[PDB]
Here is the input.
Amino acid sequence: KLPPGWEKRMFRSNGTVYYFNHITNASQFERPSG
Ligand SMILES: *[C@@H]1O[C@H](CO)[C@@H](O)[C@H](O)[C@H]1NC(C)=O
Here is the structure.
């Protein structure tokens, strides 16, 4: 869906999950894959 560089990421201290683009530095909660 969204580009290569997005990867799954997790908020320590509450356990929430999101995605992070380690190629651009962006963050989004909807998943470019799943
Ligand atoms: C969990 O913490 C992050 C920041 O660490 C925050 O952005 C996120 O909204 C929190 N989870 C929920 C369900 O709000």
